[PDB]
Amino acid sequence: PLLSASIVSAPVVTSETYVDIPGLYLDVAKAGIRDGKLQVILNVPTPYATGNNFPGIYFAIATNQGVVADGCFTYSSKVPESTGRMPFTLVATIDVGSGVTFVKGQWKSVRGSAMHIDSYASLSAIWGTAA
Amino acid sequence: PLLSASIVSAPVVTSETYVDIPGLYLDVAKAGIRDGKLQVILNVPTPYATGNNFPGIYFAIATNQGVVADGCFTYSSKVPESTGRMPFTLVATIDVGSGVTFVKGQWKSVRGSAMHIDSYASLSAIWGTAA
Amino acid sequence: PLLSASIVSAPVVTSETYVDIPGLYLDVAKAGIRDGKLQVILNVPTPYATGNNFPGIYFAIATNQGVVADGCFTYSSKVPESTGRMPFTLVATIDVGSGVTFVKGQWKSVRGSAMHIDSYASLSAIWGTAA
Ligand SMILES: C[C@@H]1O[C@H](NC(=O)c2ccc(-c3cccc(CN)c3)o2)[C@@H](O)[C@H](O)[C@@H]1O
Ligand SMILES: C[C@@H]1O[C@H](NC(=O)c2ccc(-c3cccc(CN)c3)o2)[C@@H](O)[C@H](O)[C@@H]1O
Ligand SMILES: C[C@@H]1O[C@H](NC(=O)c2ccc(-c3cccc(CN)c3)o2)[C@@H](O)[C@H](O)[C@@H]1O
């Protein structure tokens, strides 16, 4: 009933759209889970953003149906003196009965920001069923 | 065994006391849960605070018995150049056997701050029983 | 199936190595859990760091086998005007079958920082077994 994927880095990218964070992927269908609920946690404890205009990163939890939940961090200065690490966690509960076969973490730039993961990050789920 | 409530906004308020975040409410009694433990996650991934004196927000998890756990974020400048988004997660485990009928997220101003949610936020619980 | 430990303070320390956060300890063996998986959440919602050189704190989840996962927060200024509270959550899933008898939260200084907890912090686990 516990699913988990974790990474320690990702190639630095920018994106104006949500794009997969490589490695943060849970295959629900492959685990034989076809109904009930998943409580999903995207945990990016040590990201940073680089950019010229109050940098930050949007993160999402997505399924094959798209983004279920999202949020961001942003710095409080236009060009931070140093881009500090800004812990980020997002939590969503999904109905698998809706047609879900996978869960992924995604990211999007804030204002053109380059997006950095260079240490542990995780995607976690707990499956709960009323049966 | 998985409970969830989520919002995308709340009216902007100030408060010197913990006050409910509208919509972040789980009715435990209504789910027929009267004993065991709940692991509760309050997830406010994208809040900001506005104010004149090192702004921030306190968040709590509360039951009908009151606040079980709380914490805050605060900015590192007196009047931030821009009030950046400051991800916030709080996690507490409650004994339902103690007399619990609901769980809520609450917020309180730091130093007079106006409190802002204008995107996804969640309250989640997993029920665990030794029986 | 739900384990939890929580604190409201810890003596202020520095460390160049990961050192236990007193009180954030889960005894897995004592609970008779010897296989399956644990989804562990370290939740430090209100820490701050004090120091002279872009302060911050590293946090880890560790077992008797060592650190499984870690991350940090850091400020974006060399000597913050005020050291604001920087919420921190870390999530990891552990195989108990690997030889695990306890789970702990740990911390390490960033750049010599003194490490501060003076309010609620938690260590949480959910045990999941395929049996
Ligand atoms: C952009 C700057 O990044 C610096 N950190 C690192 O360069 C770094 C390199 C490896 C790690 C790192 C992190 C978390 C867990 C671990 C352990 N695998 C390792 O951090 C910060 O100190 C600074 O404040 C800035 O944000
Ligand atoms: C106060 C400023 O707020 C800005 N963001 C927004 O005005 C905004 C409007 C909708 C959203 C928003 C957030 C997270 C997920 C989603 C998607 N539903 C949408 O953000 C920041 O960029 C800036 O750094 C400051 O903090
Ligand atoms: C270092 C400064 O610390 C200040 N907060 C406190 O001195 C304080 C003392 C007790 C608490 C505190 C926190 C969270 C939950 C609770 C409730 N038990 C209580 O905070 C900040 O306001 C400021 O921005 C700075 O970070």
Numbering used by the authors:
A (entry chain A), B (entry chain A), C (entry chain A): 1 to 131
What do the authors report?
BC2L-C is a new type of lectin from Burkholderia cenocepacia that binds (mammalian) fucosides at the N-terminal domain and (bacterial) mannosides at the C-terminal domain. BC2L-C presents a double carbohydrate specificity, with a Man-specific carbohydrate recognition domain (CRD) in the C-terminal domain and a Fuc-specific CRD in the trimeric N-terminal domain. Thus, BC2L-C can contribute to adhesion and colonization by simultaneously binding bacterial mannosides and human fucosides, and it has been dubbed a superlectin. We have recently described the rational design and synthesis of a first group of antagonists of Burkholderia cenocepacia BC2L-C lectin, a candidate target for AAT against this pathogen, which is associated with fatal pulmonary infections of cystic fibrosis patients.
In order to understand the atomic details of the interaction, the structure of BC2L-C-Nt was solved in complex with compound 3. The electron density revealed, without ambiguity, that ligand 3 displaced all of the blood group oligosaccharide. Only the hexagonal crystal form was refined at 1.55 Å, with one protomer in the asymmetric unit and the trimer forms, by applying the 3-fold crystallographic symmetry. All the interactions at the fucose moieties are equivalent to the one described in previous structures, with the binding site located in a shallow groove at the interface between protomers. Binding interactions involve direct H-bonds of all the fucoside oxygens with Thr74, Arg85*, Thr83* and Arg111 (* amino acid from neighboring protomer). Two structural waters mediate H-bonds between O2 and O3 hydroxyls and Ser 82*, Tyr58 and Tyr75, and hydrophobic contacts are made with Tyr48* ring and the C6 methyl. On the aglycone part, only the two nitrogen atoms are involved in hydrogen bonds mediated through water molecules. The terminal amine is interacting with the main chain oxygen of Asp118* via two water molecules, the main chain nitrogen of Tyr120* and OD1 atom of Asp70 via one water molecule, and with the OD2 atom of Asp70 via two water molecules. The amine in compound 3 occupies the position of a water molecule in the complex of 2, which was involved in mediating the interaction between the amine and the side chain of Asp70. The affinities measured corroborate the NMR-STD results, showing that 3, with a KD of 159 µM, is only 3 times less potent than the H-type 1 tetrasaccharide, and is over one order of magnitude more potent than α-methyl fucoside.
